[PDB]
Amino acid sequence: EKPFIARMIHAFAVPIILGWLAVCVVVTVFVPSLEAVGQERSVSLSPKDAPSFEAMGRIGMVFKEGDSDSFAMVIIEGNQPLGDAAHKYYDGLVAQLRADKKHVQSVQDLWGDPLTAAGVQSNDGKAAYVQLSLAGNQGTPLANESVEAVRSIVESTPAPPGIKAYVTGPSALAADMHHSGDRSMARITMVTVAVIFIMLLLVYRSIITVVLLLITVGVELTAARGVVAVLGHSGAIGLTTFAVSLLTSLAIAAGTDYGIFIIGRYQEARQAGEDKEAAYYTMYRGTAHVILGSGLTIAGATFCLSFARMPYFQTLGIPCAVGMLVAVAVALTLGPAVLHVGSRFGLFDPKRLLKVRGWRRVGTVVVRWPLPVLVATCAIALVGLLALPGYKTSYNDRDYLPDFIPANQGYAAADRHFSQARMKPEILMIESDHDMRNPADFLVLDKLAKGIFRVPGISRVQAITRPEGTTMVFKNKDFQRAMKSFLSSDGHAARFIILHRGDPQSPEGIKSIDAIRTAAEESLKGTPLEDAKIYLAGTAAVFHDISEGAQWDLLIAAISSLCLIFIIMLIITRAFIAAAVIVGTVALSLGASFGLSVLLWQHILAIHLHWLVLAMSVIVLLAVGSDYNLLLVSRFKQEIGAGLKTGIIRSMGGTGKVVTNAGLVFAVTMASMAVSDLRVIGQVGTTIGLGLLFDTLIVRSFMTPSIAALLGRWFWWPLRVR
Amino acid sequence: IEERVKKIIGEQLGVKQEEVTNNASFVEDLGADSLDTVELVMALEEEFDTEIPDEEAEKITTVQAAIDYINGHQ
Known part of the structure; x- marks a missing residue:
């Protein structure tokens, strides 16, 4: 019994091979490489409904310090304690950054103010930093461009003798993560094919048999990555370096496996004495529905990730599912076709007893x-x-x-001069229904500041009452400058900056967040600001949602x-x-x-x-x-x-x-x-x-x-x- | 029927159906081993809808013994 589908693939063997070869030239020429598409179609990392994420947006909007959840910090390092010469360099660098409204939404300048410079200067005096609020959310194509603009500006400015500058922060790291992923794609594939080639050579002991098998994979890979690039280039889906890297390996892996089954079963038919045509049809009956069944499994299984909440897992859904389906379609069609043509020239017969x-x-x-x-x-x-x-x-x-x-x-x-937490601050903000620029409210805020300072894992608490993060009127002109960065300009809200002892990224650091909310809430209870809404955001705050999100x-x-x-x-x-x-x-x-x-x-x-x-x-x-x-x-x-x-x-x-x-x-x-x-x-x-x-x-x-x-x-x- | 039994033994031990003789022993004459004879007994079980105990599998060491067992219990 010869199934119809295998019969037409048999009859249209060479046309099928030509057709897919054409698909692999129309693609990769009329669309940018999949790596390029990912760069232009990256997705934000923070889920849009995470309380930490929206809190970061809320905090920025009230204080006019931008609206994105993508901040970055510029660090100054010198071989000697930073003298006044560094300040001159710092002021010029800040001036340039503040001008670029396109990328640097606002620069929270602190080291330039004597009343708060000591609160950012390194204990050794050899390092200082300033934070920037960049346009575009973390990992988005705008953010990567913005970080590069900031990085170029820092590099462009000539540093004084013995002075170095660096750019850090979650935004900068995310962009560099993307480039590193793309940069290493070539090495992943080259090693993968080279290792597979050696393995397949030993299995079949036939160079010709391997080459045709890999070329089948290559057409399988290019079509798989090719189609996904088409969707990404049209804006139908968002991508991430994980999707690009994971999809490539799966296509090569799943592509080769479908090839092995096709050659494997067919070779067994020849061992049994089957004719070339009969062996081909025997191969189809025993492996065609297996490949299709297995093809939908990988495509279907990876599609389930689309139901996940985190953008990392969500973006794996369609790019992998679409990619695997294409690689499967090539396998189920190009697979038998190349086998038939290869059989016509007598190349696929086994070289060793099975x-x-x-x-x-x-x-x-x-x-x-x-x-x-x-x-x-x-x-x-x-x-x-x-x-x-x-x-x-x-x-x-x-x-x-x-x-x-x-x-x-x-x-x-940063680690060479600061505690590891100083580069990952948390910001706590509370919104009221009235102005706070009065001693009565100030006392309530001071009580709140004291309570948080004693929370386990906390190291420093910047506040209008703690200009330098430690114990110390607000109407003073210098304090007004300080007040301009800790209170809403003319609003009903105030903010604090919290520094942990020990990295917030640790699970212990994550636990500190709930203590802050509880401690702040109870400190706010029993005083007129009790009804004030609380917003908490920062590195630890973000990953509290990540831990609860990913685990679920x-x-x-x-x-x-x-x-x-x-x-x-x-x-x-x-x-x-x-x-x-x-x-x-x-x-x-x-x-x-x-x-x-x-x-x-x-x-x-x-x-x-x-x-x-x-x-x-x-x-x-x-x-x-x-x-x-x-x-x-x-x-x-x-x-x-x-x-x-x-x-x-x-x-x-x-x-x-x-x-x-x-x-x-x-x-x-x-x-x-x-x-x-x-x-x-x-x-x-x-x-x-x-x-x-x-x-x-x-x-x-x-x-x-x-x-x-x-x-x-x-x-x-x-x-x-x- | 001796024909199908001979066919199964010939296939399992990789010897032509005509070479095997009724008096031949699976292990001594045909060069079989423990797992080969286990496969023999199980295949004969499934072929003729028959069941064998370990007490008998060890007892059936020759083609004729299997023939007698299968024909008697058919």
Whole structure:
């Protein structure tokens, strides 16, 4: 029986190859490279409804210090205590920044005022800093441009002898993170293909066989990245360097795996003695619906991220889903087509015997003794939870970027002269319904300032009553200048600047925020300002929402995948329990990946996992891991007919070797991303690599077949058997 | 029927169906091992809708023994 679709792909082989070659030239020529599109179509990092984010906007708007949540700090460092010469340099630098209304919305100048200069000068006197409110939210294309404008201005100004300047802050770091991600894209791909080429060469021992397989991947990759660039260039979707990097590796990984299945099954047909045409159709029947089923799995699974709340996860939804669907379409169409043309010239016939003795022996043990193996494999999957008690997520974006990026360079200057918190201040503001420029209210504010100063983890509290962050009339002319930066110009609100002891990015730092709100609220109670609304924003404030956001939406992403993947498997196999087992075993196996990934990074390497790692990696693990089970289980369906146990044994003989090669390629393809400067993506790549390595070698080899034999006929409910 | 039994043994141990003889032993004559004979018994179980205990699997070490067991229980 020759299916119609395979028949037309067979008949229109060369036209299909030409058609996709044309798509890969029309794209990449009529659209800018996907990296360029991401630069022009980046997305803001802060979710638009986070209380911290809107508080930052509210704080800025009232004080006229801009309206974006994207601030940056310019640091001055000198080999000797900063003399008056530095002030002259500082004043000129500030003057230029204040002129550029396009990018520098406002400059909170403090070091220029003697009444507050000492409160910003370094304790050693060799360093000082000034903060800027840049246009455009963090990570947006406007913000990256604005930071560059600021950075160019700082560089342009000639520094006095022995004086250095740097630009830092969350805005500057986010932009440099984007450039580093794009800059390392070339190295990720070059290493990925080079490593895959060596691996495939050993597997097939045929250079020609590998080259055609990779060229199939390249067309798969270019179309995948090509189409996503088209959507991004048209403004239909927002991108991030994680989407660009993750999408590229998935296309190469998923692209190669679909190639291995096509060549793998076809080669097996030749070993059995099938004719060239008959082998081709045999390949299609046994792998066409598997690739389509697996293709929708990765595209569908990654699309579930679109339901996440954080912009990082939300923006992975469409770019990955659209990209994977395109790569799948090329695989299901260009795959068989190149195979047919390659067969016409006799290139794809196996060069070594496709031995199956090794895997059949494993099948005999598993099927004959399912439960004893099942328990053994099930337990070793769960013991990966031993890392969960000691798991500690991290948020310090500094540590997950190269030391030499400009943002980290300035931070290094900050640590050399200031406590690490001085470059990450929190700002607390309260709105009233009346003016506060009276001693009566001032006393209430002073009481509030005292209360916050004693909150655990707090180091300094700038206030109108504390011009230098420490204990000390307001109507004095100099104090009026100070009042112009701590009270609303003529409004009903006041603000304070809070400095922690210890990095706010630590989970301990995050906990300090709720204390501030509670302490401020109780201090405000019992006094006329009790009704005043409180706004809190800053580095710690932002990540309070991140911690609550990421920890929750992870369930939204992972749980949604289980339902979506289960549906795709169910419609494919048309069997209820089989679909559950296909994805169920991988779900139980997530513990093994959890333990392995944490053990390698947190313990062996002493580097905590970035908060993005689990949410981004789990979806791929749950998607690709189920694909291998789908392939194996689909082979059970065909082989059955002699007998369930017999079908399982001979099924693992055929698909046993193919999946292992496919599994290692995907694991190595995702693991190769560790070479990226963006260490965050490397953790995502390694976590996927370790998990898929575990899934292919235990979940697919032992769990699924063992469960398959144990259930017997019910495994294919409601389908009839024998 | 001896034909299908011979076919299954010939396939599993990778020897032509005509070479195998009724008096031949799976392990001694045909060079089988423990897992090979386990697969033999399980395949014969599934082929003819029959079940075997471990007490018998160890007992069936020759083609003729399997033939007698299957034909008697058919």
